[PDB]
Amino acid sequence: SRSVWKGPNIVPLPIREAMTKGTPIRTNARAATILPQFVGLKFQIHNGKEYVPIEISEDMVGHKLGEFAPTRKRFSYTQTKNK
Amino acid sequence: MNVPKARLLKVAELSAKIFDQNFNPSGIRTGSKILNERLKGPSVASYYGNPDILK
Amino acid sequence: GNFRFPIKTKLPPGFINARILRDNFKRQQFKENEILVKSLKFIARNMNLPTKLRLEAQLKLNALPNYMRSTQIKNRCVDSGHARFVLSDFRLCRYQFRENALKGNLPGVKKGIW
Amino acid sequence: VVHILGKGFKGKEVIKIALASKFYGIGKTTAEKICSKLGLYPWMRMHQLSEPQIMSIASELSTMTIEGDARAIVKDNIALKRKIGSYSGMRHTLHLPVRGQHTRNNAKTARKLNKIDRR
Amino acid sequence: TRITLPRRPAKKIQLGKSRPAIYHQFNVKMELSDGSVVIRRSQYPKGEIRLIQDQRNNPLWNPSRDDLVVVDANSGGSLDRFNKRYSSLFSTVELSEENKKKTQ
Amino acid sequence: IQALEKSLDELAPLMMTKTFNTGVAKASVIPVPLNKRQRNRIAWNWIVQSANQRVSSDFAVRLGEELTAIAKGTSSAFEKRDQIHKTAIAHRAYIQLK
RNA sequence: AAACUCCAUAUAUAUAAUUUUAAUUAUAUAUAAUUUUAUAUUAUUUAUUAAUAUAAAGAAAGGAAUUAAGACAAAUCAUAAUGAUCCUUAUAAUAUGGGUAAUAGACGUGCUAUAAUAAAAUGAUAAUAAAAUUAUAUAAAAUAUAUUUAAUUAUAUUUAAUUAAUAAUAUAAAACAUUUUAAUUUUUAAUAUAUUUUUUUAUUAUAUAUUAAUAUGAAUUAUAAUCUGAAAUUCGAUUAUAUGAAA
Ligand SMILES: [Mg+2]
Ligand SMILES: [Mg+2]
Ligand SMILES: [Mg+2]
Ligand SMILES: [Mg+2]
Ligand SMILES: [Mg+2]
Ligand SMILES: [Mg+2]
Ligand SMILES: [Mg+2]
Ligand SMILES: [Mg+2]
Ligand SMILES: [Mg+2]
Ligand SMILES: [Mg+2]
Ligand SMILES: [Mg+2]
Ligand SMILES: [Mg+2]
Ligand SMILES: [Mg+2]
Ligand SMILES: [Mg+2]
Ligand SMILES: [Mg+2]
Ligand SMILES: [Mg+2]
Ligand SMILES: [Mg+2]
Ligand SMILES: [Mg+2]
Ligand SMILES: [Mg+2]
Ligand SMILES: [Mg+2]
């Protein structure tokens, strides 16, 4: 956990266009902190291959952006291993 | 520790002024260590030697 | 006319490999503006200054290109370019410190016996 | 046998250790504070409690987060994580480690214990 | 394999004894976001409720309201923790510092 | 000290039957003598194992109790000594000058 | 092969104004042993001798490096280098994210435990070491904090001295003494008791179970802080309040 006195992790994002025009924000900044001003905004978070669209909620505030954009999908085992 | 703290801190800041030293009685985060850290750029830059060696 | 990096830097005299060139460029750029990084880090971590100053300082730190971060620098073998088991006393990788040592290239190194 | 809030205690064990052990939410420090507040000497046993003393312990220990309340807080926190859609909530649902541990080997106790209804 | 509770012999409600269902209910006062209070006939046993968010504080239901205070569920998040843990870094003047990335 | 010495000497066997693979039909079980250190080791193992059947929580106390009992000729370790010797007798004739 | 070689050992000389101290040391040269001598009891090619012991003269007893020729078409083209072949708007070069950290099963190494020939607290004229590190630094003492008078533990405040036989990393830890320790009714406390007094004895209470997880064990997880970094979500390390699997 980042020290509180340092302040939240902050990154330049096109928030003005999203607040007024409603354009979704597409970013690779998965380490940015969801500030309370991002509630109700449409984000699209990179995951290495594709940008996952999510809309920030009140409960998500304070978390990081990449916490909702999984990078590797669920592990599965092919039972019919054969040989 | 019978001596009052007021006397001890009076000696503390007097010495600090004499010896050109910081005095932060409250212990707040002044960030002094950031500035006082040495610059290592000259040494890190010459890791691969003199680029002007005769060829 | 198509230099791989924004600033035209000189070339190392010894062994050169693409990776070395990258690391060397990072070294020179970090050296150039390490004072700026230190000043910005001070402001962004100072609660005695207005929070706007902290905000802009943090913003400008986050915007600095990768080639000004000290953390980016990785020590490499100056004779082979390998970036594992590099001994700072010689800047030589493993098996190149050994080879050169046996050759007697290193000023005082010896075969360990005790 | 001394019964406090439905918890069975032998007559030989010290109050502080027994309290810290049987109740979910109070540890060594909280038990020490509880015993000190009611004036029970540090190494007093459960035999020597009187009915007023047992009542005071039950009453004073019921003004702080009970076993059920603490478990509710934990479960609510997990539910928050899962409903947000966070990575950690996903690990809880799948019975997998949540603190960045390796799953290629081990990860047995996480599978056995991690769940959305953690105790 | 269905979960079904077995059915007991249904009692005979012979003709003329079909009494109506009058479920126990309480005269319960419903406090809205404003001072408005409406009396609702409810089964749950407690007489007053406050509605944290309701039609009063919903923009959809009050298009003409210039000033409209907004409040949401308080379970944990911005209003709860982000504020007290970060109570020095302040502003929407500050929101203009991270306004745009100036990227095409 | 001499109580322990006589305890070890009386309790420890003089010779034990060590089975050797010699003998295709059956392993040759021939008595073989033991020096003092070997005998003391066997006796000590017996009295320690016997001293571990006592209620105290400190093995200095339980070792002392067993040693006192042995000093008065009261313990089961003697039966083991007799069994080994009877076994050695049961194997009289296979000893060879070699 | 052995020997010369290096660490270590015993001794001699030299250096050090014994405030870089420790001289009980440091490191240069040299000597020493791959020990010698005597006696006897042995088997023998008959002391033109080997092992058995004794005796007496010795400080005298170890480790490291060096692993031949050939064989394994053993490993390495990912230390590096070249032959052949293949790519040249891409198989070369840069940046932002992700992966190398995925988990059914299996497997080789280790760490930590499953309690009383063993774990925990405390021990300030601070019991007792060696070898290493500190110009891309080491960081004492004092402070605020958690936290109570203090101590211990972890951060923050500030840099004392030292770029080193000088100061710091750093009061070594086990050891040893005292106290405690569930299973354990082998315990506690209420009275008396007394030439066991930190203790014995008599009566009452110290319940509910059984092969068992404790005041063993710290896995998993909730929350709040802290450190490094521009950045700790995938994916870092500590502290505190709870959690307390398996064994
Ligand atoms: Mg690095
Ligand atoms: Mg508890
Ligand atoms: Mg001296
Ligand atoms: Mg040789
Ligand atoms: Mg060979
Ligand atoms: Mg051969
Ligand atoms: Mg091959
Ligand atoms: Mg290859
Ligand atoms: Mg190559
Ligand atoms: Mg490419
Ligand atoms: Mg790997
Ligand atoms: Mg190995
Ligand atoms: Mg133990
Ligand atoms: Mg030393
Ligand atoms: Mg030395
Ligand atoms: Mg200190
Ligand atoms: Mg000590
Ligand atoms: Mg079990
Ligand atoms: Mg424990
Ligand atoms: Mg803990």
Side-chain angles (χ1 to χ4, degrees), chain A, chain B, chain C, chain D, chain E residues 1-91, chain F:
Chain A
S1 165
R2 181 176 181 169
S3 293
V4 162
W5 66 273
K6 277 167 157 132
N9 200 11
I10 56 156
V11 185
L13 308 180
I15 192 181
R16 204 61 40 170
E17 60 170 10
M19 266 169 21
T20 85
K21 296 112 203 178
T23 304
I25 289 147
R26 177 130 62 179
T27 55
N28 303 5
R30 304 161 51 84
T33 315
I34 302 147
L35 304 158
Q37 324 174 335
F38 297 169
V39 172
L41 271 43
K42 311 187 271 312
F43 268 81
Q44 295 177 7
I45 313 132
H46 202 231
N47 76 333
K49 196 182 183 183
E50 178 266 2
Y51 300 80
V52 185
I54 58 66
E55 172 206 340
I56 287 324
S57 66
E58 161 66 5
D59 292 359
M60 297 175 173
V61 166
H63 283 86
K64 289 304 188 65
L65 281 184
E67 194 80 286
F68 326 105
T71 88
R72 41 175 94 102
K73 39 217 162 309
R74 302 313 313 128
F75 164 80
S76 39
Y77 181 65
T78 56
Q79 210 276 308
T80 61
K81 181 178 37 194
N82 214 21
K83 204 59 175 301
Chain B
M1 316 142 187
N2 315 129
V3 293
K5 325 209 209 165
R7 317 284 300 139
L8 285 204
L9 66 93
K10 183 178 179 180
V11 200
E13 97 293 7
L14 202 44
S15 295
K17 310 321 161 272
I18 287 192
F19 286 104
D20 165 30
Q21 200 170 352
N22 277 290
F23 183 62
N24 187 18
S26 60
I28 54 104
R29 277 170 154 129
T30 58
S32 57
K33 56 180 184 175
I34 293 174
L35 299 166
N36 196 34
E37 183 178 2
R38 307 170 162 182
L39 302 171
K40 37 155 81 165
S43 305
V44 82
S46 38
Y47 183 90
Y48 291 104
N50 198 306
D52 311 62
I53 288 317
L54 209 68
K55 310 186 187 306
Chain C
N2 53 337
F3 209 81
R4 30 165 72 101
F5 305 120
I7 298 86
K8 293 179 179 179
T9 78
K10 235 169 289 181
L11 231 53
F15 191 34
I16 301 140
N17 192 31
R19 319 176 191 275
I20 300 173
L21 288 186
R22 258 203 317 269
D23 189 53
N24 178 41
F25 175 76
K26 283 171 194 177
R27 284 176 193 268
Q28 314 308 307
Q29 291 326 301
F30 158 70
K31 166 213 162 53
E32 218 81 2
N33 34 29
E34 100 284 7
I35 294 148
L36 163 76
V37 170
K38 183 168 71 172
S39 295
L40 292 178
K41 177 164 179 156
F42 181 58
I43 293 158
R45 306 259 190 288
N46 189 217
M47 320 135 287
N48 289 337
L49 283 159
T51 64
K52 154 198 303 300
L53 250 193
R54 299 174 70 174
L55 196 274
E56 63 92 7
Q58 195 61 42
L59 259 295
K60 179 128 38 195
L61 265 177
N62 192 31
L64 282 194
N66 65 268
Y67 54 75
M68 305 155 76
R69 319 302 206 165
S70 64
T71 317
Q72 286 285 10
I73 306 303
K74 174 107 177 73
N75 290 347
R76 311 195 69 85
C77 195
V78 284
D79 273 349
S80 80
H82 206 47
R84 293 188 179 273
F85 217 122
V86 152
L87 312 178
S88 317
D89 312 84
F90 306 110
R91 297 168 197 176
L92 265 304
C93 35
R94 198 192 53 84
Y95 185 86
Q96 295 295 100
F97 155 77
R98 157 170 192 264
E99 182 182 6
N100 300 359
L102 302 174
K103 300 173 173 177
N105 307 158
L106 315 182
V109 190
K110 246 181 302 191
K111 203 184 175 201
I113 287 303
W114 72 91
Chain D
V1 62
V2 155
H3 299 270
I4 306 178
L5 295 174
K7 290 292 183 176
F9 295 102
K10 201 179 178 298
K12 178 222 199 213
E13 69 278 32
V14 194
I15 308 287
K16 37 184 53 176
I17 312 195
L19 268 283
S21 67
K22 292 293 181 56
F23 294 102
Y24 177 79
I26 55 132
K28 179 182 61 180
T29 67
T30 42
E32 164 198 58
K33 288 194 172 186
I34 278 164
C35 299
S36 34
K37 177 189 304 318
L38 313 181
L40 312 174
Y41 60 97
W43 302 108
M44 181 181 247
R45 251 98 172 160
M46 290 275 188
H47 192 136
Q48 319 157 254
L49 302 168
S50 195
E51 196 74 31
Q53 292 185 20
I54 286 191
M55 208 39 73
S56 56
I57 273 297
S59 295
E60 181 279 357
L61 190 141
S62 149
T63 203
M64 45 194 54
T65 278
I66 299 304
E67 325 181 69
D69 178 28
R71 286 197 227 273
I73 283 148
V74 175
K75 290 154 184 308
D76 162 48
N77 295 158
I78 278 75
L80 195 33
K81 282 171 180 255
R82 166 210 42 62
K83 147 202 72 49
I84 276 145
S86 64
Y87 187 67
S88 77
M90 252 305 265
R91 323 281 319 161
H92 274 296
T93 53
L94 301 164
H95 315 79
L96 288 171
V98 196
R99 312 227 171 157
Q101 322 147 22
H102 281 50
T103 46
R104 183 177 150 201
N105 254 10
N106 323 104
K108 291 328 173 138
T109 180
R111 186 186 304 101
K112 159 187 54 186
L113 265 158
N114 278 359
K115 47 168 52 61
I116 281 303
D117 289 345
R118 193 174 184 89
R119 312 191 21 171
Chain E
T1 176
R2 290 197 52 166
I3 309 160
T4 69
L5 66 179
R7 176 165 296 272
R8 293 204 201 143
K11 203 159 295 184
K12 214 172 71 153
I13 300 279
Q14 64 180 20
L15 279 58
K17 293 178 179 178
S18 76
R19 317 191 42 183
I22 313 167
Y23 299 113
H24 200 117
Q25 263 154 359
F26 299 94
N27 264 82
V28 168
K29 328 209 240 192
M30 281 301 325
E31 182 72 81
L32 282 185
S33 287
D34 289 345
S36 283
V37 181
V38 303
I39 309 319
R40 182 179 181 274
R41 196 62 168 175
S42 64
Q43 301 203 246
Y44 204 86
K46 43 166 282 303
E48 81 186 9
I49 309 78
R50 260 152 199 90
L51 300 181
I52 275 71
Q53 62 193 189
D54 176 288
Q55 79 221 318
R56 268 34 172 159
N57 35 48
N58 201 289
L60 182 269
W61 277 267
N62 324 293
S64 178
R65 276 278 272 299
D66 191 10
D67 51 340
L68 198 142
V69 316
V70 85
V71 59
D72 217 1
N74 305 346
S75 183
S78 83
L79 175 135
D80 197 14
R81 300 147 199 191
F82 187 92
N83 300 151
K84 64 217 166 43
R85 103 186 314 151
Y86 294 123
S87 313
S88 297
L89 248 185
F90 285 163
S91 73
Chain F
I1 278 143
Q2 323 100 289
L4 181 152
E5 274 279 8
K6 293 179 179 179
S7 177
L8 292 188
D9 185 1
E10 75 188 70
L11 190 45
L14 293 104
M15 80 287 288
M16 66 77 94
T17 36
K18 166 60 67 56
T19 169
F20 295 97
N21 306 0
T22 299
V24 49
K26 175 61 187 178
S28 178
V29 166
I30 61 171
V32 54
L34 314 167
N35 41 348
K36 199 42 174 179
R37 185 182 294 275
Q38 288 172 355
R39 297 185 49 219
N40 289 337
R41 150 169 298 272
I42 294 160
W44 181 256
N45 173 356
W46 284 347
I47 70 158
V48 170
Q49 186 173 355
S50 186
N52 275 1
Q53 303 182 300
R54 309 193 163 268
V55 315
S56 163
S57 34
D58 179 306
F59 295 148
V61 160
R62 305 142 53 120
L63 196 61
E65 296 266 18
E66 213 60 56
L67 289 189
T68 288
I70 279 290
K72 296 161 179 173
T74 50
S75 163
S76 180
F78 305 93
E79 142 56 10
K80 315 165 178 55
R81 173 276 292 281
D82 189 16
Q83 169 62 21
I84 299 177
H85 284 129
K86 291 193 296 287
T87 299
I89 301 180
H91 298 101
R92 66 184 182 277
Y94 329 119
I95 177 181
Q96 73 292 342
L97 278 67
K98 195 59 180 300

